[PDB]
Amino acid sequence: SKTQIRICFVGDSFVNGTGDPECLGWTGRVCVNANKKGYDVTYYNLGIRRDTSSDIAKRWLQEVSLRLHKEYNSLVVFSFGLNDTTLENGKPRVSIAETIKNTREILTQAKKLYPVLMISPAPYIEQQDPGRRRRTIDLSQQLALVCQDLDVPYLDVFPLLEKPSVWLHEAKANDGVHPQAGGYTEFARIVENWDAWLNWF
Template sequence: MSETGDRTGVDRASVHPLGQRSVAEVTLAEFATRWVMQVADVAEIGRYAAYNERLRALPRPARRIVLLGDSITEFWGDLQVLSPDGPQLINRGIFGQRTVQMLLRIQEDVIGLEPDAMVLTAGANDVRAFVGDAASAGEAARVRIGRNIASMTDIARAHGITMTIGSMTPVCDKPDAPQTLHRDPGKIREMNLWLEAFARERQFGYLDYFSALAGEDGLMQQAFTDDGLHPNPDGYQRMAEMLERSCVTQGG
């Protein structure tokens, strides 16, 4: 064993997040990240906590479906209007979330509600580039999305929950919202190819929201969005038609 190694032979100084550096050597970004992790609910688990508690206290419906996602799901609003006499549809989308945050809250917002099925639509914020051009978030985002989605679906399947994957939705530019500066349309298409192949391999359902909303150029049709990123009522109607036709809402 080395002088710095522990009983497993690992040099803890080399793998510790801060190593042996002094406080002065720690960057502001590193400190901020660790401080937020220490004091904050980074996954926003508390967001739906009271609603989840109330749901668990009510008689369980014949069929319950949870839609987990980011703002694309959250802004869809009250999903029950899509199925007033059908399965209970529960919206568990949160604005701005990445797949890792959904993974952290899946126990509370999905598993704890004991649904029959889950529809997972995620990735829009993972592929967003905050620094550099839109394509710079490509490969790292694909690996991160793939790892987190695989983990979430494994957890769901272990609890007997039927899985459906929703594709990432397209983007387009608006005069005051140049979305393609931050999200590369080509990377979104590549990610959707992976998502579809993953769903097919795992024998999950797949909802191709992208094709329902995109034009021939691969961008969101202008009529289906007001900000270039989120569907507007007409866009959500196209998504709803696809969801209603799918086996997930039909009990298949």
């Protein structure tokens, strides 16, 4: 009889798995993997398309609180930042200073209640914004630092999903942004080889 684990994945469209025709994304595939290691996983996907760190800051505690409880093994995984970096009227939807402040507030709170992990944003080539890559690398480095200071494991998937990874090829043959089964499978395989993920399961 298997050990029950409940996991909430909180984030944006990459956490939701938008673009995957198999409707799993990376979050679904890593839960399937955990099930093959003899766990009985309750999978709660709390990704919402277009969410920034400010949107997640506002909703995450009320949604996660209804799903996870101290009487069962629980884990919360956060992944966001791509939408913070988006320029609207030439200005980022959330400034890097605000993103960092949100991330600290979210993680400080989560750390007190639940086991927590965080994953970096993934590659996205936006033709009208070539500066997006650099701003995303800058953000991810800052997120890594916040996580370091709070002893929350942080997985940088960004470099492993650039070429020759199939991620961007799939995204561009779909809607420009979201990859399909191949890309989400590569993302999952990275997560599965992460020491913090392994050393928790």
